Amino acid sequence: DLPLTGAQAELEGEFGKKADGLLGMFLKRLSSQLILLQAWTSHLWKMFY
Amino acid sequence: PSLWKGLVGIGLFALAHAAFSAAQHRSYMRLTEKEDESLPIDIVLQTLLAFAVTCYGIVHIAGEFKDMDATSELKNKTFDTLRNHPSFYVFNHRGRVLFRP
Amino acid sequence: PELLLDSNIRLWVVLPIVIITFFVGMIRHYVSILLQSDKKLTQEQVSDSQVLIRSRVLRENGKYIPKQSFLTRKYYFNNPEDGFGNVTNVLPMILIGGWINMTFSGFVTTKVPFPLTLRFKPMLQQGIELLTLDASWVSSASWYFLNVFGLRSIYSLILGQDNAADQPADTNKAFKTEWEALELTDHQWALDDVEEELMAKDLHFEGMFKKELQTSIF
Amino acid sequence: PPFISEAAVRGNAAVLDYCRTSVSALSGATAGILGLTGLYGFIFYLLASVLLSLLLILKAGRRWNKYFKSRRPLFTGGLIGGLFTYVLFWTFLYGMVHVY
Protein backbone atom coordinates (compact mmCIF):
# COMPACT_ATOMS: atom_id res chain seq x y z
CA ASP A 1 0.00 0.00 0.00
CA LEU A 2 1.13 3.53 -0.77
CA PRO A 3 2.61 5.62 2.06
CA LEU A 4 0.18 7.66 4.12
CA THR A 5 -0.48 11.10 2.63
CA GLY A 6 2.10 13.63 3.75
CA ALA A 7 -0.50 16.37 4.16
CA GLN A 8 -2.07 14.10 6.80
CA ALA A 9 0.93 12.07 7.98
CA GLU A 10 2.68 15.29 9.03
CA LEU A 11 -0.66 16.77 10.11
CA GLU A 12 -0.80 13.96 12.68
CA GLY A 13 1.96 15.71 14.62
CA GLU A 14 0.36 19.17 14.53
CA PHE A 15 -3.28 18.04 14.91
CA GLY A 16 -4.70 16.31 17.96
CA LYS A 17 -1.66 17.25 20.05
CA LYS A 18 -1.78 18.22 23.71
CA ALA A 19 -0.45 21.76 24.17
CA ASP A 20 -1.60 23.36 27.44
CA GLY A 21 -4.34 23.27 30.07
CA LEU A 22 -8.10 23.29 29.67
CA LEU A 23 -8.04 26.77 28.08
CA GLY A 24 -5.80 25.75 25.17
CA MET A 25 -7.24 22.77 23.32
CA PHE A 26 -10.65 24.36 22.79
CA LEU A 27 -9.09 27.61 21.54
CA LYS A 28 -6.92 25.73 19.06
CA ARG A 29 -9.92 23.62 18.03
CA LEU A 30 -12.01 26.71 17.30
CA SER A 31 -9.10 28.23 15.37
CA SER A 32 -8.92 25.00 13.36
CA GLN A 33 -12.67 25.25 12.73
CA LEU A 34 -12.19 28.84 11.53
CA ILE A 35 -9.44 27.85 9.10
CA LEU A 36 -11.59 24.92 7.92
CA LEU A 37 -14.40 27.40 7.25
CA GLN A 38 -11.95 29.58 5.33
CA ALA A 39 -10.89 26.56 3.27
CA TRP A 40 -14.53 25.73 2.53
CA THR A 41 -15.17 29.31 1.40
CA SER A 42 -12.05 29.20 -0.78
CA HIS A 43 -13.14 25.93 -2.40
CA LEU A 44 -16.53 27.32 -3.43
CA TRP A 45 -14.95 30.53 -4.76
CA LYS A 46 -13.46 28.72 -7.78
CA MET A 47 -16.87 27.32 -8.75
CA PHE A 48 -17.19 30.07 -11.38
CA TYR A 49 -13.66 31.52 -11.05
CA PRO B 1 -40.02 36.19 30.54
CA SER B 2 -38.55 35.60 27.07
CA LEU B 3 -34.96 34.99 28.23
CA TRP B 4 -35.60 31.26 28.68
CA LYS B 5 -36.07 30.86 24.92
CA GLY B 6 -32.67 32.45 24.35
CA LEU B 7 -31.14 30.25 27.05
CA VAL B 8 -32.50 27.03 25.53
CA GLY B 9 -31.41 28.15 22.06
CA ILE B 10 -27.89 28.82 23.33
CA GLY B 11 -27.84 25.41 25.00
CA LEU B 12 -28.95 23.66 21.81
CA PHE B 13 -26.34 25.55 19.78
CA ALA B 14 -23.61 24.58 22.26
CA LEU B 15 -24.71 20.93 22.15
CA ALA B 16 -24.62 20.99 18.34
CA HIS B 17 -21.15 22.55 18.39
CA ALA B 18 -19.95 19.86 20.80
CA ALA B 19 -21.41 17.18 18.52
CA PHE B 20 -19.60 18.63 15.50
CA SER B 21 -16.35 18.85 17.47
CA ALA B 22 -16.62 15.23 18.63
CA ALA B 23 -17.35 14.04 15.09
CA GLN B 24 -14.40 16.00 13.68
CA HIS B 25 -12.08 14.63 16.38
CA ARG B 26 -13.20 11.06 15.70
CA SER B 27 -12.70 11.53 11.95
CA TYR B 28 -9.20 12.91 12.52
CA MET B 29 -8.32 10.12 14.95
CA ARG B 30 -9.41 7.34 12.60
CA LEU B 31 -6.91 8.69 10.05
CA THR B 32 -3.87 8.35 12.32
CA GLU B 33 -4.93 4.82 13.41
CA LYS B 34 -4.32 5.34 17.13
CA GLU B 35 -6.03 2.84 19.44
CA ASP B 36 -5.52 4.95 22.59
CA GLU B 37 -9.18 6.09 22.62
CA SER B 38 -8.38 9.64 23.72
CA LEU B 39 -11.57 11.58 24.46
CA PRO B 40 -10.76 15.20 25.39
CA ILE B 41 -12.14 16.27 28.76
CA ASP B 42 -13.14 19.77 27.61
CA ILE B 43 -15.65 18.35 25.12
CA VAL B 44 -17.26 16.22 27.84
CA LEU B 45 -17.46 19.21 30.18
CA GLN B 46 -18.96 21.40 27.45
CA THR B 47 -21.62 18.88 26.43
CA LEU B 48 -22.57 18.12 30.04
CA LEU B 49 -22.86 21.82 30.85
CA ALA B 50 -24.93 22.45 27.73
CA PHE B 51 -27.26 19.54 28.53
CA ALA B 52 -27.74 20.70 32.13
CA VAL B 53 -28.39 24.31 31.10
CA THR B 54 -30.80 23.26 28.36
CA CYS B 55 -32.78 20.97 30.67
CA TYR B 56 -32.98 23.63 33.38
CA GLY B 57 -34.15 26.22 30.85
CA ILE B 58 -36.71 23.91 29.27
CA VAL B 59 -38.17 22.88 32.63
CA HIS B 60 -39.22 26.53 33.15
CA ILE B 61 -41.26 26.96 29.93
CA ALA B 62 -43.52 23.89 29.96
CA GLY B 63 -46.25 25.95 31.63
CA GLU B 64 -47.65 26.49 35.11
CA PHE B 65 -49.67 24.20 37.35
CA LYS B 66 -53.26 24.94 38.35
CA ASP B 67 -55.13 24.08 41.53
CA MET B 68 -57.37 21.03 41.30
CA ASP B 69 -59.91 22.46 43.77
CA ALA B 70 -63.09 23.16 41.82
CA THR B 71 -64.04 26.05 44.15
CA SER B 72 -60.78 27.99 43.71
CA GLU B 73 -61.50 30.30 40.75
CA LEU B 74 -65.02 31.21 41.95
CA LYS B 75 -63.78 33.08 45.04
CA ASN B 76 -63.74 36.29 42.97
CA LYS B 77 -66.80 35.62 40.80
CA THR B 78 -69.70 37.95 41.57
CA PHE B 79 -73.43 37.86 40.86
CA ASP B 80 -73.16 40.87 38.53
CA THR B 81 -71.60 38.74 35.78
CA LEU B 82 -73.66 35.63 36.58
CA ARG B 83 -77.07 37.14 35.79
CA ASN B 84 -76.08 38.17 32.24
CA HIS B 85 -77.46 35.81 29.59
CA PRO B 86 -76.11 36.71 26.11
CA SER B 87 -78.79 34.62 24.39
CA PHE B 88 -81.66 36.57 26.00
CA TYR B 89 -80.34 40.11 25.53
CA VAL B 90 -82.94 42.81 24.90
CA PHE B 91 -82.10 46.32 23.68
CA ASN B 92 -85.27 48.05 24.93
CA HIS B 93 -84.12 50.21 27.85
CA ARG B 94 -82.93 53.71 28.75
CA GLY B 95 -79.41 53.19 27.39
CA ARG B 96 -80.61 54.08 23.90
CA VAL B 97 -82.32 57.25 25.14
CA LEU B 98 -79.33 58.47 27.16
CA PHE B 99 -76.86 58.11 24.26
CA ARG B 100 -78.06 59.87 21.09
CA PRO B 101 -81.88 59.53 21.41
CA PRO C 1 -14.64 -0.40 14.53
CA GLU C 2 -15.00 -3.57 12.46
CA LEU C 3 -16.22 -1.95 9.24
CA LEU C 4 -15.20 1.20 7.37
CA LEU C 5 -18.14 3.14 5.94
CA ASP C 6 -18.40 5.86 3.30
CA SER C 7 -19.43 9.25 4.67
CA ASN C 8 -21.57 9.79 1.56
CA ILE C 9 -23.98 7.05 2.64
CA ARG C 10 -24.34 8.79 6.01
CA LEU C 11 -24.97 12.12 4.29
CA TRP C 12 -27.47 10.81 1.72
CA VAL C 13 -29.30 7.73 3.07
CA VAL C 14 -29.76 8.39 6.79
CA LEU C 15 -31.33 11.86 6.93
CA PRO C 16 -33.80 11.43 4.00
CA ILE C 17 -35.48 8.49 5.74
CA VAL C 18 -36.12 10.58 8.86
CA ILE C 19 -37.33 13.59 6.86
CA ILE C 20 -39.66 11.45 4.74
CA THR C 21 -41.21 9.61 7.69
CA PHE C 22 -41.65 12.84 9.69
CA PHE C 23 -43.41 14.70 6.89
CA VAL C 24 -45.45 11.62 5.91
CA GLY C 25 -46.75 11.44 9.48
CA MET C 26 -47.58 15.15 9.46
CA ILE C 27 -49.39 14.85 6.11
CA ARG C 28 -51.32 11.83 7.39
CA HIS C 29 -52.46 13.78 10.45
CA TYR C 30 -53.56 16.80 8.42
CA VAL C 31 -55.37 14.67 5.83
CA SER C 32 -57.14 12.70 8.57
CA ILE C 33 -58.29 16.00 10.07
CA LEU C 34 -59.40 17.23 6.64
CA LEU C 35 -61.96 14.47 6.01
CA GLN C 36 -62.57 13.15 9.53
CA SER C 37 -66.38 12.78 9.45
CA ASP C 38 -69.72 14.52 8.94
CA LYS C 39 -72.49 13.30 11.26
CA LYS C 40 -76.10 14.46 11.67
CA LEU C 41 -78.58 13.57 14.42
CA THR C 42 -82.35 13.96 14.59
CA GLN C 43 -84.12 15.86 17.36
CA GLU C 44 -85.42 12.76 19.16
CA GLN C 45 -81.92 11.32 19.56
CA VAL C 46 -80.43 14.42 21.19
CA SER C 47 -83.55 14.95 23.32
CA ASP C 48 -83.40 11.37 24.63
CA SER C 49 -79.65 11.65 25.25
CA GLN C 50 -80.16 14.84 27.26
CA VAL C 51 -82.95 13.15 29.24
CA LEU C 52 -80.64 10.21 30.01
CA ILE C 53 -77.87 12.59 31.10
CA ARG C 54 -80.33 14.44 33.35
CA SER C 55 -81.45 11.17 34.94
CA ARG C 56 -77.83 10.12 35.51
CA VAL C 57 -77.01 13.50 37.07
CA LEU C 58 -80.05 13.18 39.35
CA ARG C 59 -78.96 9.71 40.47
CA GLU C 60 -75.40 10.92 41.07
CA ASN C 61 -76.10 14.23 42.85
CA GLY C 62 -79.48 13.94 44.53
CA LYS C 63 -77.68 14.30 47.88
CA TYR C 64 -77.51 18.12 47.66
CA ILE C 65 -81.25 18.93 47.61
CA PRO C 66 -84.08 18.51 50.13
CA LYS C 67 -85.37 14.94 50.28
CA GLN C 68 -88.90 15.97 49.31
CA SER C 69 -87.72 17.39 45.98
CA PHE C 70 -85.55 14.32 45.35
CA LEU C 71 -88.51 11.98 45.88
CA THR C 72 -90.78 14.27 43.84
CA ARG C 73 -88.36 13.91 40.94
CA LYS C 74 -88.12 10.19 41.74
CA TYR C 75 -91.90 9.84 41.48
CA TYR C 76 -91.29 11.29 38.03
CA PHE C 77 -89.01 9.38 35.62
CA ASN C 78 -90.56 6.13 36.88
CA ASN C 79 -94.29 6.20 36.08
CA PRO C 80 -94.69 8.76 33.24
CA GLU C 81 -91.26 8.66 31.56
CA ASP C 82 -89.35 5.38 31.90
CA GLY C 83 -92.16 3.04 30.88
CA PHE C 84 -94.46 5.52 29.12
CA GLY C 85 -61.41 7.18 5.83
CA ASN C 86 -59.21 4.40 7.20
CA VAL C 87 -57.45 3.22 4.01
CA THR C 88 -55.19 6.28 4.11
CA ASN C 89 -54.62 5.65 7.83
CA VAL C 90 -52.80 2.30 7.41
CA LEU C 91 -52.20 1.50 3.72
CA PRO C 92 -49.73 4.39 3.12
CA MET C 93 -47.51 2.97 5.87
CA ILE C 94 -47.09 -0.35 4.03
CA LEU C 95 -46.85 1.39 0.65
CA ILE C 96 -44.08 3.73 1.83
CA GLY C 97 -42.26 0.84 3.51
CA GLY C 98 -42.33 -1.12 0.27
CA TRP C 99 -41.22 1.88 -1.79
CA ILE C 100 -38.32 2.56 0.60
CA ASN C 101 -37.32 -1.11 0.50
CA MET C 102 -37.38 -0.91 -3.30
CA THR C 103 -35.39 2.31 -3.74
CA PHE C 104 -33.04 2.25 -0.72
CA SER C 105 -32.24 -1.30 0.44
CA GLY C 106 -28.81 -2.82 -0.09
CA PHE C 107 -26.27 -1.40 2.37
CA VAL C 108 -25.47 -1.15 6.07
CA THR C 109 -27.14 1.88 7.67
CA THR C 110 -26.05 2.10 11.33
CA LYS C 111 -25.35 0.12 14.50
CA VAL C 112 -27.08 0.03 17.89
CA PRO C 113 -24.75 0.72 20.85
CA PHE C 114 -25.77 -2.26 22.98
CA PRO C 115 -25.02 -5.96 22.50
CA LEU C 116 -27.78 -8.25 21.24
CA THR C 117 -28.37 -11.94 20.58
CA LEU C 118 -28.91 -13.94 17.40
CA ARG C 119 -32.68 -13.53 17.80
CA PHE C 120 -32.40 -9.87 16.76
CA LYS C 121 -30.46 -10.61 13.56
CA PRO C 122 -33.33 -11.81 11.29
CA MET C 123 -35.30 -8.61 12.00
CA LEU C 124 -32.66 -5.88 11.55
CA GLN C 125 -30.93 -7.16 8.38
CA GLN C 126 -33.72 -7.67 5.85
CA GLY C 127 -31.78 -6.40 2.84
CA ILE C 128 -28.19 -7.58 3.32
CA GLU C 129 -27.12 -11.08 2.27
CA LEU C 130 -24.26 -11.71 4.70
CA LEU C 131 -24.21 -14.70 7.05
CA THR C 132 -21.81 -14.14 9.97
CA LEU C 133 -22.37 -10.39 10.42
CA ASP C 134 -23.31 -9.25 13.92
CA ALA C 135 -26.90 -8.34 14.77
CA SER C 136 -26.04 -4.79 15.85
CA TRP C 137 -25.64 -3.62 12.25
CA VAL C 138 -29.00 -2.72 10.71
CA SER C 139 -30.39 -2.41 7.19
CA SER C 140 -32.37 0.47 5.70
CA ALA C 141 -35.87 -1.02 6.12
CA SER C 142 -35.26 -1.86 9.78
CA TRP C 143 -34.03 1.69 10.35
CA TYR C 144 -37.16 3.04 8.65
CA PHE C 145 -39.46 0.92 10.82
CA LEU C 146 -37.55 1.91 13.96
CA ASN C 147 -37.86 5.59 13.02
CA VAL C 148 -41.59 5.12 12.38
CA PHE C 149 -42.13 3.45 15.75
CA GLY C 150 -40.02 5.97 17.67
CA LEU C 151 -41.94 9.17 16.92
CA ARG C 152 -45.27 8.87 18.79
CA SER C 153 -44.08 11.02 21.70
CA ILE C 154 -42.51 13.56 19.34
CA TYR C 155 -45.78 13.84 17.41
CA SER C 156 -47.71 14.22 20.67
CA LEU C 157 -45.31 16.96 21.78
CA ILE C 158 -44.86 19.09 18.64
CA LEU C 159 -48.49 18.63 17.56
CA GLY C 160 -51.79 19.11 19.38
CA GLN C 161 -53.04 16.14 21.44
CA ASP C 162 -52.31 12.74 19.80
CA ASN C 163 -52.69 11.69 16.15
CA ALA C 164 -50.66 10.82 13.02
CA ALA C 165 -50.22 7.18 14.05
CA ASP C 166 -51.91 3.80 14.20
CA GLN C 167 -53.29 2.35 17.43
CA PRO C 168 -77.14 4.58 21.99
CA ALA C 169 -77.97 1.15 20.56
CA ASP C 170 -81.64 0.90 21.59
CA THR C 171 -83.55 3.65 23.37
CA ASN C 172 -85.83 1.17 25.15
CA LYS C 173 -82.88 -0.85 26.45
CA ALA C 174 -81.23 2.28 27.86
CA PHE C 175 -84.53 3.38 29.40
CA LYS C 176 -84.94 0.00 31.12
CA THR C 177 -81.32 0.01 32.30
CA GLU C 178 -81.65 3.48 33.83
CA TRP C 179 -85.01 2.58 35.37
CA GLU C 180 -83.47 -0.48 37.04
CA ALA C 181 -80.37 1.43 38.16
CA LEU C 182 -82.33 4.35 39.64
CA GLU C 183 -84.78 2.16 41.59
CA LEU C 184 -82.17 1.10 44.18
CA THR C 185 -80.93 4.63 44.99
CA ASP C 186 -82.00 6.30 48.24
CA HIS C 187 -81.62 9.86 49.45
CA GLN C 188 -78.75 10.65 51.84
CA TRP C 189 -78.71 14.35 52.69
CA ALA C 190 -75.26 15.93 52.99
CA LEU C 191 -76.37 19.00 55.00
CA ASP C 192 -77.47 17.31 58.24
CA ASP C 193 -74.53 18.58 60.33
CA VAL C 194 -73.16 21.47 58.27
CA GLU C 195 -73.68 23.95 61.12
CA GLU C 196 -71.53 22.01 63.58
CA GLU C 197 -68.74 21.76 60.99
CA LEU C 198 -68.95 25.52 60.42
CA MET C 199 -68.90 26.32 64.15
CA ALA C 200 -65.63 24.44 64.75
CA LYS C 201 -63.30 27.29 63.77
CA ASP C 202 -63.29 30.97 62.86
CA LEU C 203 -63.79 32.02 59.26
CA HIS C 204 -60.74 32.40 57.02
CA PHE C 205 -60.66 36.18 56.63
CA GLU C 206 -56.91 36.13 55.88
CA GLY C 207 -55.54 37.28 52.54
CA MET C 208 -58.79 38.93 51.45
CA PHE C 209 -58.16 42.67 52.03
CA LYS C 210 -54.79 42.85 50.27
CA LYS C 211 -54.16 44.80 47.02
CA GLU C 212 -56.41 47.79 46.26
CA LEU C 213 -59.88 48.35 44.84
CA GLN C 214 -59.80 48.59 41.05
CA THR C 215 -60.28 52.08 39.62
CA SER C 216 -60.71 51.58 35.86
CA ILE C 217 -59.83 49.19 33.04
CA PHE C 218 -56.31 47.76 32.82
CA PRO D 1 -60.75 18.07 48.34
CA PRO D 2 -64.46 17.21 48.11
CA PHE D 3 -64.74 18.55 44.54
CA ILE D 4 -62.19 17.98 41.77
CA SER D 5 -61.94 19.63 38.35
CA GLU D 6 -60.81 17.40 35.48
CA ALA D 7 -59.35 20.27 33.43
CA ALA D 8 -56.65 21.08 35.99
CA VAL D 9 -55.50 17.47 36.38
CA ARG D 10 -55.45 16.95 32.61
CA GLY D 11 -53.39 20.11 32.16
CA ASN D 12 -50.94 18.98 34.84
CA ALA D 13 -50.66 15.58 33.14
CA ALA D 14 -49.99 17.29 29.80
CA VAL D 15 -47.25 19.43 31.36
CA LEU D 16 -45.64 16.37 32.95
CA ASP D 17 -45.74 14.46 29.65
CA TYR D 18 -44.19 17.41 27.81
CA CYS D 19 -41.35 17.65 30.34
CA ARG D 20 -40.73 13.89 30.36
CA THR D 21 -40.65 13.52 26.58
CA SER D 22 -38.38 16.53 26.04
CA VAL D 23 -35.92 15.56 28.78
CA SER D 24 -35.80 11.95 27.56
CA ALA D 25 -35.04 13.07 24.01
CA LEU D 26 -32.34 15.49 25.17
CA SER D 27 -30.75 12.88 27.46
CA GLY D 28 -30.67 10.38 24.61
CA ALA D 29 -29.04 12.96 22.35
CA THR D 30 -26.33 13.86 24.86
CA ALA D 31 -25.68 10.20 25.71
CA GLY D 32 -25.21 9.51 22.01
CA ILE D 33 -22.86 12.49 21.72
CA LEU D 34 -20.74 11.38 24.68
CA GLY D 35 -20.12 8.06 22.93
CA LEU D 36 -21.27 5.97 25.89
CA THR D 37 -22.33 2.44 25.00
CA GLY D 38 -23.69 -0.63 26.72
CA LEU D 39 -25.46 -0.86 30.06
CA TYR D 40 -23.10 1.84 31.33
CA GLY D 41 -25.00 4.37 29.23
CA PHE D 42 -28.25 3.07 30.71
CA ILE D 43 -27.07 4.35 34.10
CA PHE D 44 -26.81 7.86 32.67
CA TYR D 45 -30.45 7.66 31.58
CA LEU D 46 -31.59 6.86 35.12
CA LEU D 47 -29.45 9.70 36.44
CA ALA D 48 -31.05 12.08 33.94
CA SER D 49 -34.51 10.94 35.04
CA VAL D 50 -33.67 11.70 38.66
CA LEU D 51 -32.50 15.18 37.68
CA LEU D 52 -35.82 15.86 35.97
CA SER D 53 -37.78 14.87 39.06
CA LEU D 54 -35.63 17.14 41.22
CA LEU D 55 -36.38 20.14 39.01
CA LEU D 56 -40.09 19.30 39.16
CA ILE D 57 -39.89 19.72 42.94
CA LEU D 58 -38.51 23.23 42.47
CA LYS D 59 -41.38 23.81 40.05
CA ALA D 60 -43.91 22.49 42.57
CA GLY D 61 -42.28 24.08 45.61
CA ARG D 62 -44.33 23.89 48.78
CA ARG D 63 -48.14 23.41 48.97
CA TRP D 64 -47.78 20.70 46.31
CA ASN D 65 -50.91 19.02 47.71
CA LYS D 66 -53.03 21.56 45.81
CA TYR D 67 -51.70 20.34 42.45
CA PHE D 68 -51.25 16.59 43.07
CA LYS D 69 -52.45 13.95 45.51
CA SER D 70 -49.01 12.36 45.92
CA ARG D 71 -45.46 12.67 44.60
CA ARG D 72 -45.49 9.13 43.17
CA PRO D 73 -46.75 10.27 39.73
CA LEU D 74 -44.20 13.10 39.91
CA PHE D 75 -41.37 10.57 40.40
CA THR D 76 -42.35 7.39 38.51
CA GLY D 77 -44.54 8.96 35.82
CA GLY D 78 -43.84 7.96 32.24
CA LEU D 79 -40.82 5.63 32.20
CA ILE D 80 -41.85 3.61 29.13
CA GLY D 81 -42.09 5.85 26.08
CA GLY D 82 -39.27 8.02 27.38
CA LEU D 83 -36.96 5.00 27.29
CA PHE D 84 -37.96 4.28 23.68
CA THR D 85 -37.27 7.87 22.62
CA TYR D 86 -33.99 7.77 24.57
CA VAL D 87 -32.75 4.62 22.85
CA LEU D 88 -33.89 5.87 19.43
CA PHE D 89 -32.03 9.17 19.73
CA TRP D 90 -29.06 7.34 21.28
CA THR D 91 -28.77 5.04 18.27
CA PHE D 92 -29.32 7.90 15.82
CA LEU D 93 -26.63 10.18 17.24
CA TYR D 94 -24.15 7.38 17.99
CA GLY D 95 -24.43 6.25 14.38
CA MET D 96 -24.14 9.85 13.21
CA VAL D 97 -20.98 10.61 15.20
CA HIS D 98 -18.86 7.63 16.24
CA VAL D 99 -19.59 5.52 13.15
CA TYR D 100 -18.20 6.82 9.83
Side-chain angles (χ1 to χ4, degrees):
Chain A
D1 38 4
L2 297 179
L4 188 54
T5 156
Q8 292 189 301
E10 312 311 310
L11 175 139
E12 162 266 359
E14 61 184 358
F15 267 68
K17 172 253 302 179
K18 186 64 169 56
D20 41 350
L22 82 169
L23 287 178
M25 66 279 296
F26 89 101
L27 285 184
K28 70 182 301 299
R29 190 188 74 255
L30 60 85
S31 67
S32 301
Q33 293 178 9
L34 291 178
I35 69 179
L36 174 131
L37 169 84
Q38 185 59 250
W40 279 109
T41 56
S42 300
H43 186 277
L44 54 87
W45 170 248
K46 52 92 177 177
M47 173 61 61
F48 36 78
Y49 314 101
Chain B
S2 182
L3 59 94
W4 305 109
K5 304 291 296 182
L7 187 63
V8 66
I10 291 299
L12 291 183
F13 185 85
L15 191 61
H17 170 73
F20 176 80
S21 156
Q24 177 268 354
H25 163 269
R26 191 61 153 83
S27 181
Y28 149 78
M29 188 272 296
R30 84 134 66 261
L31 152 76
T32 59
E33 309 291 345
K34 309 304 294 180
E35 299 179 354
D36 58 334
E37 197 255 340
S38 295
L39 296 180
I41 307 300
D42 66 327
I43 302 309
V44 180
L45 299 183
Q46 175 185 176
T47 183
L48 289 180
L49 180 140
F51 158 76
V53 170
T54 314
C55 88
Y56 186 86
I58 205 160
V59 86
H60 280 175
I61 71 175
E64 294 80 9
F65 300 102
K66 294 178 296 182
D67 192 5
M68 72 163 55
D69 199 5
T71 71
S72 182
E73 65 277 359
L74 300 184
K75 278 180 168 295
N76 298 329
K77 174 67 73 66
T78 182
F79 206 83
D80 289 325
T81 77
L82 194 78
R83 64 177 305 275
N84 293 329
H85 307 144
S87 299
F88 297 94
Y89 276 166
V90 53
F91 315 97
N92 183 22
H93 50 97
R94 57 179 175 274
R96 309 293 299 274
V97 176
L98 183 61
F99 304 102
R100 194 55 50 85
Chain C
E2 296 186 4
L3 306 184
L4 184 145
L5 271 294
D6 189 10
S7 302
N8 201 284
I9 204 184
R10 175 259 297 266
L11 190 62
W12 286 88
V13 181
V14 182
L15 312 178
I17 296 297
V18 186
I19 305 301
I20 286 178
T21 184
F22 194 97
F23 283 97
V24 158
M26 302 296 294
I27 290 178
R28 176 190 290 101
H29 163 263
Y30 284 147
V31 169
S32 62
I33 283 195
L34 211 160
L35 52 140
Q36 42 94 29
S37 60
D38 277 321
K39 184 58 63 182
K40 179 58 63 182
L41 303 178
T42 184
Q43 184 175 354
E44 287 188 345
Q45 290 167 329
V46 58
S47 299
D48 293 358
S49 65
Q50 291 179 338
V51 170
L52 298 181
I53 294 178
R54 181 191 180 183
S55 180
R56 198 273 307 273
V57 123
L58 167 63
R59 162 163 45 90
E60 186 172 356
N61 289 330
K63 65 176 183 177
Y64 296 102
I65 63 173
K67 180 185 179 184
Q68 180 64 23
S69 299
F70 177 86
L71 299 178
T72 275
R73 303 178 190 263
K74 194 178 180 182
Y75 182 79
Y76 190 74
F77 269 164
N78 275 23
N79 310 279
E81 229 292 334
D82 296 359
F84 302 102
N86 193 264
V87 178
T88 325
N89 189 24
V90 46
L91 276 305
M93 180 268 299
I94 292 296
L95 262 296
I96 292 302
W99 188 84
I100 290 298
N101 183 26
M102 174 183 176
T103 192
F104 267 103
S105 61
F107 15 84
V108 174
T109 305
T110 177
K111 167 189 173 183
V112 311
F114 44 85
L116 294 177
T117 63
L118 197 139
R119 311 175 185 178
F120 299 85
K121 183 178 180 298
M123 305 177 182
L124 281 63
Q125 293 184 4
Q126 309 297 277
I128 327 177
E129 306 297 329
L130 299 185
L131 182 138
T132 172
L133 185 56
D134 197 2
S136 297
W137 309 91
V138 314
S139 58
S140 299
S142 59
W143 167 258
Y144 159 79
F145 270 96
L146 173 134
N147 217 274
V148 165
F149 263 85
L151 284 179
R152 312 301 188 90
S153 58
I154 297 302
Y155 280 165
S156 180
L157 181 142
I158 206 63
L159 188 144
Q161 212 274 335
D162 312 310
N163 203 327
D166 196 2
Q167 68 175 191
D170 291 330
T171 59
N172 301 87
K173 177 262 170 186
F175 287 168
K176 292 299 175 298
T177 301
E178 289 199 357
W179 182 94
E180 295 173 0
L182 185 67
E183 191 65 30
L184 50 85
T185 58
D186 195 2
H187 190 263
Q188 189 68 251
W189 204 16
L191 307 183
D192 280 321
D193 49 358
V194 54
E195 287 102 332
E196 277 66 25
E197 302 172 23
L198 261 183
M199 297 280 289
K201 69 199 66 57
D202 304 0
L203 294 183
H204 200 50
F205 290 144
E206 284 71 18
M208 61 171 298
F209 282 136
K210 60 179 62 180
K211 68 184 178 300
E212 188 57 36
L213 305 176
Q214 186 52 245
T215 66
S216 178
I217 57 181
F218 304 100
Chain D
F3 304 96
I4 306 296
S5 59
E6 310 291 336
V9 307
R10 287 201 274 99
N12 301 329
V15 173
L16 290 181
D17 295 0
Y18 185 96
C19 282
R20 175 65 68 176
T21 296
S22 189
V23 72
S24 300
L26 202 64
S27 60
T30 183
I33 287 316
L34 266 179
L36 308 179
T37 175
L39 307 182
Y40 205 92
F42 271 80
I43 290 183
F44 181 84
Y45 168 75
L46 267 302
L47 187 147
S49 181
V50 170
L51 179 60
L52 172 78
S53 184
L54 199 63
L55 284 182
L56 292 179
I57 295 297
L58 268 63
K59 196 174 181 60
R62 53 189 59 180
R63 73 259 188 280
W64 54 265
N65 212 329
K66 306 191 308 178
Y67 302 145
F68 303 97
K69 300 178 181 297
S70 60
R71 279 78 57 87
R72 185 206 58 82
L74 196 66
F75 270 91
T76 65
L79 287 184
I80 300 299
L83 187 63
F84 291 176
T85 303
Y86 171 92
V87 299
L88 176 127
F89 275 79
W90 194 22
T91 58
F92 173 78
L93 238 40
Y94 183 76
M96 193 65 57
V97 176
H98 277 52
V99 197
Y100 312 98

